[PDB]
PDB file of C-alpha atoms in Angstrom:
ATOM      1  CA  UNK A   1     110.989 120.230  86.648  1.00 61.30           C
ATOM      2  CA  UNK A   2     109.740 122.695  83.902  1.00 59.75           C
ATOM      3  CA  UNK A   3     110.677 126.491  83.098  1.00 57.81           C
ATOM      4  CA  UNK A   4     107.309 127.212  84.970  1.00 55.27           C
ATOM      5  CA  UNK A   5     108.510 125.668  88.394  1.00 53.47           C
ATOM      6  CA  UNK A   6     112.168 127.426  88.111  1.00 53.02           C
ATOM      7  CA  UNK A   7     110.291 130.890  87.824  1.00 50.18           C
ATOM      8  CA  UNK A   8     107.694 130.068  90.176  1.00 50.90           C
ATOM      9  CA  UNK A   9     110.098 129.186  92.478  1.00 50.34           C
ATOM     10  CA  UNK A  10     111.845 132.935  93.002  1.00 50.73           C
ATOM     11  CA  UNK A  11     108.899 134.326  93.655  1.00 52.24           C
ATOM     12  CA  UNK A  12     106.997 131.553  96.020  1.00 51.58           C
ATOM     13  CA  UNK A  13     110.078 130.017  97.670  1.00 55.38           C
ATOM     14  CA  UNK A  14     109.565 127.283 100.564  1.00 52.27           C
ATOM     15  CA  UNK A  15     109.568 128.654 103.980  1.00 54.71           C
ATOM     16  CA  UNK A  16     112.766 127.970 106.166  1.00 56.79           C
ATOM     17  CA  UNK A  17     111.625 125.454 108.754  1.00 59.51           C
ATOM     18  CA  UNK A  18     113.084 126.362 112.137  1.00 55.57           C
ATOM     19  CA  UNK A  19     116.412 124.719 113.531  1.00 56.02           C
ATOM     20  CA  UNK A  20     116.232 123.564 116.823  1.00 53.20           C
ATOM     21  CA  UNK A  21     117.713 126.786 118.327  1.00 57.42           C
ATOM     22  CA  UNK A  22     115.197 129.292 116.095  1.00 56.97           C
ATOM     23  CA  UNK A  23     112.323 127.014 118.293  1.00 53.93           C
ATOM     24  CA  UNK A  24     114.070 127.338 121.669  1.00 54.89           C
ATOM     25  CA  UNK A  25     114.518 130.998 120.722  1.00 51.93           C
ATOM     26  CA  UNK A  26     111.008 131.724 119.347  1.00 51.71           C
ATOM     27  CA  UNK A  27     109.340 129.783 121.841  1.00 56.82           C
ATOM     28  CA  UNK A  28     111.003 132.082 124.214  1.00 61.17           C
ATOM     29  CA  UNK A  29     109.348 135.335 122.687  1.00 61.15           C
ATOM     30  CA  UNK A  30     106.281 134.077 122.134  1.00 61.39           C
ATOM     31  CA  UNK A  31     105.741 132.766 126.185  1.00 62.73           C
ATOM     32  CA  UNK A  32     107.577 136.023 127.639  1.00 63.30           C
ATOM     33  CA  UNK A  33     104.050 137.693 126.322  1.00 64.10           C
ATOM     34  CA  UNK A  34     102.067 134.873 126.391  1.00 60.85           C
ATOM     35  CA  UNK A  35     100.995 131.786 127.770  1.00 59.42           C
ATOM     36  CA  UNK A  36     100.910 128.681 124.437  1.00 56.36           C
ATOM     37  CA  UNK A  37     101.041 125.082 123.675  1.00 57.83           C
ATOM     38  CA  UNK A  38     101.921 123.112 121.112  1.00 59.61           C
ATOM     39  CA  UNK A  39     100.276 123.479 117.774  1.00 59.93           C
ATOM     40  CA  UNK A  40      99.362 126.756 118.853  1.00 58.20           C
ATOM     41  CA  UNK A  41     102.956 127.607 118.713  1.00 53.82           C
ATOM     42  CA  UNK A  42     103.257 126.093 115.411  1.00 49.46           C
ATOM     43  CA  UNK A  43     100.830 127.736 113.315  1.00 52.87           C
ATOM     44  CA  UNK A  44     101.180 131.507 114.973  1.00 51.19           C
ATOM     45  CA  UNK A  45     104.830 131.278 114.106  1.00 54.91           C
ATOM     46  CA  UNK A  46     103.649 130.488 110.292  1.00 57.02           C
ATOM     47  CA  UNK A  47     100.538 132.641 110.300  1.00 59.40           C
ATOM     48  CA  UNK A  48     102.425 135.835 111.827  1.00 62.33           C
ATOM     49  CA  UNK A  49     105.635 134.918 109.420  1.00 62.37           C
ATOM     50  CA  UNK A  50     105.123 132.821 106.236  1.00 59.98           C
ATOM     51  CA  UNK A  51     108.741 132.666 105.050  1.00 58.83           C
ATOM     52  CA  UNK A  52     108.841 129.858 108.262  1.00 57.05           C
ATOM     53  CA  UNK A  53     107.605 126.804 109.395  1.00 56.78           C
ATOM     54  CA  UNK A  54     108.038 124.951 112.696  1.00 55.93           C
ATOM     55  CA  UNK A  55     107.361 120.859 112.698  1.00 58.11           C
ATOM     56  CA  UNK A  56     106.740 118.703 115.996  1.00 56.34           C
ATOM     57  CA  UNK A  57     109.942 117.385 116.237  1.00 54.50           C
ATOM     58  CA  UNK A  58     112.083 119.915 116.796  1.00 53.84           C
ATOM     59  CA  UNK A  59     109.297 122.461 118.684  1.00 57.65           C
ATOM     60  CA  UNK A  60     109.808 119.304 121.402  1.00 57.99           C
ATOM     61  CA  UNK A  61     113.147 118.886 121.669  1.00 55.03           C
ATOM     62  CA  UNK A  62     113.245 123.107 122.510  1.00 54.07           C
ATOM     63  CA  UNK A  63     110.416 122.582 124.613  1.00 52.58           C
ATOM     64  CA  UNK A  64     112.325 119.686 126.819  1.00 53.51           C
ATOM     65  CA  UNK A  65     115.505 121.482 126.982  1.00 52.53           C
ATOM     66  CA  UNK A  66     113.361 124.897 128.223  1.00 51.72           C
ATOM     67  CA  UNK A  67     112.170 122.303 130.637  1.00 46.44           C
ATOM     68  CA  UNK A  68     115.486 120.637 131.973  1.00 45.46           C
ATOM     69  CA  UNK A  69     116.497 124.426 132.525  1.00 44.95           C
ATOM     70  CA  UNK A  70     113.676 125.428 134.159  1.00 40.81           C
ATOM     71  CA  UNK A  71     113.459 128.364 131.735  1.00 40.06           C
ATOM     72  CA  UNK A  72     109.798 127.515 130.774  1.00 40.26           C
ATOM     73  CA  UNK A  73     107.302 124.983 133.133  1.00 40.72           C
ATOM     74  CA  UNK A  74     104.084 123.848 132.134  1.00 41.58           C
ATOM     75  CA  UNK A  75     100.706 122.832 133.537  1.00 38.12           C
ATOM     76  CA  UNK A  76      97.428 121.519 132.700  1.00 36.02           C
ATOM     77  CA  UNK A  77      93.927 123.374 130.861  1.00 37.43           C
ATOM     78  CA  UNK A  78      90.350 122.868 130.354  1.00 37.71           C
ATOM     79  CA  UNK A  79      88.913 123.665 126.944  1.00 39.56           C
ATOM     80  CA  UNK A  80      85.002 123.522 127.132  1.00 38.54           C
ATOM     81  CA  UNK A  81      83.704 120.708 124.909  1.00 36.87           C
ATOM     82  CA  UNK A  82      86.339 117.617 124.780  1.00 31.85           C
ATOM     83  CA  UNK A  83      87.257 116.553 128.264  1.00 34.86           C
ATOM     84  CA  UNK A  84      91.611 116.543 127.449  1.00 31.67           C
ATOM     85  CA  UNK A  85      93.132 118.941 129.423  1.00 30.80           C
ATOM     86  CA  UNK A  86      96.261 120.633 127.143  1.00 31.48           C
ATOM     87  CA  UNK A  87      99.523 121.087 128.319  1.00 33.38           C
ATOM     88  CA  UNK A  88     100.211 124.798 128.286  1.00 31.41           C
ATOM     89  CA  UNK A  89     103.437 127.011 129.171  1.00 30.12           C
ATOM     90  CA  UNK A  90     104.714 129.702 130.874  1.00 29.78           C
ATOM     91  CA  UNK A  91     107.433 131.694 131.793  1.00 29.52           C
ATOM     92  CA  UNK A  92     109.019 130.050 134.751  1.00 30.19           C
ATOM     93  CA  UNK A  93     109.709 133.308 136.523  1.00 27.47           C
ATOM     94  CA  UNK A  94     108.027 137.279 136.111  1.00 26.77           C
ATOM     95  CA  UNK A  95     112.680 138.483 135.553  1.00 29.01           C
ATOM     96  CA  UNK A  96     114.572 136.303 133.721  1.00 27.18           C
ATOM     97  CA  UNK A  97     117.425 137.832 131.299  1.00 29.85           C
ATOM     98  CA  UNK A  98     118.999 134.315 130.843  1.00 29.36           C
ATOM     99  CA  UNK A  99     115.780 133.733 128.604  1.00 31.07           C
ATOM    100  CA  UNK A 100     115.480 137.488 127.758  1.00 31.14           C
ATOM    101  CA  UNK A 101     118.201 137.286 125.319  1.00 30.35           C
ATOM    102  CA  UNK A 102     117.750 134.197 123.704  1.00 31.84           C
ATOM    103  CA  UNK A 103     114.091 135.560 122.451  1.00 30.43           C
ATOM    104  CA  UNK A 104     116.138 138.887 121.639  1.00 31.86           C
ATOM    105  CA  UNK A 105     118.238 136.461 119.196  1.00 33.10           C
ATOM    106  CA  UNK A 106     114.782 135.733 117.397  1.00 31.27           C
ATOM    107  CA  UNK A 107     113.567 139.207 116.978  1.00 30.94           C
ATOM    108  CA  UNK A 108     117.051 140.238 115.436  1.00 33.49           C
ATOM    109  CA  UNK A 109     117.059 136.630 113.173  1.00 32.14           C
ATOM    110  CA  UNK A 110     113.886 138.611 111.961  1.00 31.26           C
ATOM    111  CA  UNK A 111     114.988 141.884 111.172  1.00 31.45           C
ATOM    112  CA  UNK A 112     115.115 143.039 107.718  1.00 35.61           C
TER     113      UNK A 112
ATOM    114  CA  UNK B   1     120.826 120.152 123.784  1.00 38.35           C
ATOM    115  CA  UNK B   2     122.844 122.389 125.802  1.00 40.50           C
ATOM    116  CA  UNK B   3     123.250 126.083 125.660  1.00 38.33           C
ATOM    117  CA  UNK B   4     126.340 126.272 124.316  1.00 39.47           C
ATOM    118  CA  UNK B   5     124.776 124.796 121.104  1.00 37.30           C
ATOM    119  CA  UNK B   6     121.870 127.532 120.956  1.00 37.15           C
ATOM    120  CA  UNK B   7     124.883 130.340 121.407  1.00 34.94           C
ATOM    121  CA  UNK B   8     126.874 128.573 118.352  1.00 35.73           C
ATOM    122  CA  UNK B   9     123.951 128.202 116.140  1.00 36.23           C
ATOM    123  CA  UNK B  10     123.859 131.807 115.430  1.00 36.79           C
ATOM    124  CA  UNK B  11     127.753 132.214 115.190  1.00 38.08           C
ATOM    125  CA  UNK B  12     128.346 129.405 112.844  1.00 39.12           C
ATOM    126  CA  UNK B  13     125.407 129.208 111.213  1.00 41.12           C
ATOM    127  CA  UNK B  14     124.433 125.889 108.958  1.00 42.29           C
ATOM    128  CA  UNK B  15     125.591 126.605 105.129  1.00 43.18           C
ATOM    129  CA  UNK B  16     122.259 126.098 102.639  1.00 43.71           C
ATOM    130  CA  UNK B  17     121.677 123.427 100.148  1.00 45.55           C
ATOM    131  CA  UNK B  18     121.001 124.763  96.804  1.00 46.42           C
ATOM    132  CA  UNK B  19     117.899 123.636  95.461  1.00 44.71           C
ATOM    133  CA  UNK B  20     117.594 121.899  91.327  1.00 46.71           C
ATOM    134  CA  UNK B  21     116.125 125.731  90.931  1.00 46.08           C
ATOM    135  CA  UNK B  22     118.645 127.496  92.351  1.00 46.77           C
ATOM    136  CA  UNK B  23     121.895 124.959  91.567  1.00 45.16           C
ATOM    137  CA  UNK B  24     120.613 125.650  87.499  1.00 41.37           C
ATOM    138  CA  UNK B  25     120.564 129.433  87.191  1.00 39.04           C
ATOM    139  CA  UNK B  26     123.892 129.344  89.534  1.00 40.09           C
ATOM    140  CA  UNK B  27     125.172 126.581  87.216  1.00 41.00           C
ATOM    141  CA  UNK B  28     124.175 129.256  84.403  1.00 41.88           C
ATOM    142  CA  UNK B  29     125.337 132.232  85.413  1.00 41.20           C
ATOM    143  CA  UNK B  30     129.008 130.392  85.651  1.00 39.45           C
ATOM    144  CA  UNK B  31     128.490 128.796  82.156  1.00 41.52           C
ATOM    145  CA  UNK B  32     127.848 132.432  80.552  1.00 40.22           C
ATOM    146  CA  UNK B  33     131.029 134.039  80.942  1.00 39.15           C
ATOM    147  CA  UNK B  34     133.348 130.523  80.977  1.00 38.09           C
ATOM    148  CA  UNK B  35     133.489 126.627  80.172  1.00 37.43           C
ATOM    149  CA  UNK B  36     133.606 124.781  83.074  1.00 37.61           C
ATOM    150  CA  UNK B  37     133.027 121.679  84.921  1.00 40.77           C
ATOM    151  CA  UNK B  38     131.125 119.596  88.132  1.00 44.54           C
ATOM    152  CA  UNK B  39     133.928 119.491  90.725  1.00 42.96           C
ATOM    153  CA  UNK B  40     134.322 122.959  89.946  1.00 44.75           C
ATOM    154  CA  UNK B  41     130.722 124.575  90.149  1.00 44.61           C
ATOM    155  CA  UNK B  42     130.449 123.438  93.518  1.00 44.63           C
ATOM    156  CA  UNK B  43     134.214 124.177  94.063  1.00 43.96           C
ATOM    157  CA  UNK B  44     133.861 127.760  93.019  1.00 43.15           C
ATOM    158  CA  UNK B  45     130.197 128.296  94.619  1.00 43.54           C
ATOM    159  CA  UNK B  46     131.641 127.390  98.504  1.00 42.00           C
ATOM    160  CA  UNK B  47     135.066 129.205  98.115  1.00 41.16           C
ATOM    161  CA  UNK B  48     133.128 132.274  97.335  1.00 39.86           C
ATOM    162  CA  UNK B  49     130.004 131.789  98.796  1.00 37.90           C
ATOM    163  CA  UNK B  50     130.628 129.573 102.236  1.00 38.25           C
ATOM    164  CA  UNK B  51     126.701 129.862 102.682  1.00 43.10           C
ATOM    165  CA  UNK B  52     126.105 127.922 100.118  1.00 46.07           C
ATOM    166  CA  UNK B  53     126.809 123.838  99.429  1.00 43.07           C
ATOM    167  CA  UNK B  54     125.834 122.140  96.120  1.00 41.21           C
ATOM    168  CA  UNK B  55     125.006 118.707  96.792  1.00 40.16           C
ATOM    169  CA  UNK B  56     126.413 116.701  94.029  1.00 36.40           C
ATOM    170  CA  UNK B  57     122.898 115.434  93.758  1.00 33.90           C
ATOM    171  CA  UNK B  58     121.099 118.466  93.079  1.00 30.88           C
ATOM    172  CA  UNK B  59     124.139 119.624  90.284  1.00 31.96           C
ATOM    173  CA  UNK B  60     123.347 116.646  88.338  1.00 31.83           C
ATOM    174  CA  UNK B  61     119.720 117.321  88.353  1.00 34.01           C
ATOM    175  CA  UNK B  62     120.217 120.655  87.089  1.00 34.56           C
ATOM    176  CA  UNK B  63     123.228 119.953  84.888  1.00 35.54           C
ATOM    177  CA  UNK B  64     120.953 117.137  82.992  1.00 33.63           C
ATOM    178  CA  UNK B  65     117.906 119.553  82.954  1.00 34.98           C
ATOM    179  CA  UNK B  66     120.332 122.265  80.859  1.00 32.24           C
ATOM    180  CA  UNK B  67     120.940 119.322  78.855  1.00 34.65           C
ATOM    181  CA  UNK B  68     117.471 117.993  77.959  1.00 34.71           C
ATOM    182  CA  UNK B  69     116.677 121.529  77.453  1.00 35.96           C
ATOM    183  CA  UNK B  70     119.304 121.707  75.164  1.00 36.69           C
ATOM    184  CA  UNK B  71     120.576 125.179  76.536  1.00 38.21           C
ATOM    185  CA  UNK B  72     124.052 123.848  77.548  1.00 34.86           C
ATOM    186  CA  UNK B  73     126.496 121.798  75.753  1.00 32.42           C
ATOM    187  CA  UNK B  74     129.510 118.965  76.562  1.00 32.65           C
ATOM    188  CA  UNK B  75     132.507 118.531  75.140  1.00 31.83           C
ATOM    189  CA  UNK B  76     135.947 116.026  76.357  1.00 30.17           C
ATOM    190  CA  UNK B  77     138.913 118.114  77.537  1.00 26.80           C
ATOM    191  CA  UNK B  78     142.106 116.510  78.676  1.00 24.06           C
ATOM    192  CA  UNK B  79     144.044 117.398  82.214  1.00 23.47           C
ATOM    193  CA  UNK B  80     147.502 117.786  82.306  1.00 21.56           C
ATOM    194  CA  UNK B  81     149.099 114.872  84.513  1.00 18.74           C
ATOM    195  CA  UNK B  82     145.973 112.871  84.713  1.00 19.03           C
ATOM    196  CA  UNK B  83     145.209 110.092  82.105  1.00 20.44           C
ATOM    197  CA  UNK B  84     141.707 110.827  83.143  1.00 25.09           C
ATOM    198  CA  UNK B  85     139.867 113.252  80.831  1.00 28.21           C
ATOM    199  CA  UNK B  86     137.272 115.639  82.289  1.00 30.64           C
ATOM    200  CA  UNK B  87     133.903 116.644  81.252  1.00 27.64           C
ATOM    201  CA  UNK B  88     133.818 120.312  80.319  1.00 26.64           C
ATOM    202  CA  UNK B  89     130.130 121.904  80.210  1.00 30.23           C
ATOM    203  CA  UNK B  90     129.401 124.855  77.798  1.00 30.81           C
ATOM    204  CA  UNK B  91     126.838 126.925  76.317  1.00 33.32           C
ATOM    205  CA  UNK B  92     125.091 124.954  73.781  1.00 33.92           C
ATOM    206  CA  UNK B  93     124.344 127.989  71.252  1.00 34.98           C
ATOM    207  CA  UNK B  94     125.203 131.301  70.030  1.00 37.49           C
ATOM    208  CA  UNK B  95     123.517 133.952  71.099  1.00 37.30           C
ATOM    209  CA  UNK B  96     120.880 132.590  73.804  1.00 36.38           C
ATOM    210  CA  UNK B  97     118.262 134.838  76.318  1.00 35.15           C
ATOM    211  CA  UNK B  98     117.152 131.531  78.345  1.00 34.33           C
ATOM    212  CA  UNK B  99     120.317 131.210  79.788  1.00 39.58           C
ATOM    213  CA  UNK B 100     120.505 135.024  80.367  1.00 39.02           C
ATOM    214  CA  UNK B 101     117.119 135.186  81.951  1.00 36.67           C
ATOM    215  CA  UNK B 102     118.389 132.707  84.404  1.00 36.33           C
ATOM    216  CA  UNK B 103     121.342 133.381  85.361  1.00 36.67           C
ATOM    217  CA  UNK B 104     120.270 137.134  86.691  1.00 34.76           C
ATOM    218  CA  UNK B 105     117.534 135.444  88.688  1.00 33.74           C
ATOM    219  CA  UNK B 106     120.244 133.752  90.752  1.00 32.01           C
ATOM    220  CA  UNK B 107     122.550 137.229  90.575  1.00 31.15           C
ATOM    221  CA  UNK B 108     119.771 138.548  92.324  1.00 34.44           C
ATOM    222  CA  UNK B 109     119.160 136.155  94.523  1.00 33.72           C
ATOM    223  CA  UNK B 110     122.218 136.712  96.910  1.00 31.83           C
ATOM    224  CA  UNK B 111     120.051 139.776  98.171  1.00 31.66           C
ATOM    225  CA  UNK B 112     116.706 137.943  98.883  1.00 29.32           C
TER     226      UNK B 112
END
């Protein structure tokens, strides 16, 4: 590494990739106002907040354990031009607080 | 993959890894104002910083990059009790700005 990476480095620094719980978390408040799937859930995160990134592995391992909880469910969509239907998701339920608060977590982890 | 885990995430959160980028201005803000050594950087950074882990790794990346940069010098001091010497690191020169320039990067840092 040169001077000119140190420097650039303060100013531009790599995003924090979610941890497993940020997903399960931010999943959470992105479905309780919207219906998503996958990479859809990837790049809005990054898109709508730079300083973060969210791979495949660990978006899947929140999305099974919202799934063994029955927190989120998800179902099947058409997408005019490709015949592949994508798996999309949902809140599981219209009042839920035990998923309420865990996407409150994310918007505080955000604050400031 | 339980709850429990998601609702211990945010109350013990992970410590971060300093980066070669980070782990040199740290390692030069410490080498302004005192001598010192490897066990201690990282010895001194988590005592007073339990955020933050140096990864004996990334201090030797940065500690040799001082080096070929010739902005830190190393000298052979002996330990009391311990036939084993110990390699003290020190400001190479004088009167240096690199080092200063650095090391207020990483004072500032702690905010951002």
């Amino acid at each position: 590494m040169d001077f000119e990476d140190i420097y650039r480095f303060f100013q531009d620094p790599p995003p924090h990739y979610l941890s497993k719980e940020l997903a399960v978390c931010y999943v959470l408040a992105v479905l309780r106002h919207e219906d998503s799937y996958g990479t859809e859930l990837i790049q809005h995160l990054e898109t709508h907040w730079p300083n973060y990134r969210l791979s495949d592995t660990v978006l899947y391992t929140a999305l099974k354990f919202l799934e063994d909880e029955q927190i989120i469910s998800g179902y099947w969509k058409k997408v005019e031009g490709r015949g592949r239907p994508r798996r999309m998701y949902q809140l599981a339920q219209a009042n839920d607080d035990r998923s309420r608060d865990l996407a409150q977590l994310w918007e505080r982890y955000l604050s400031s």
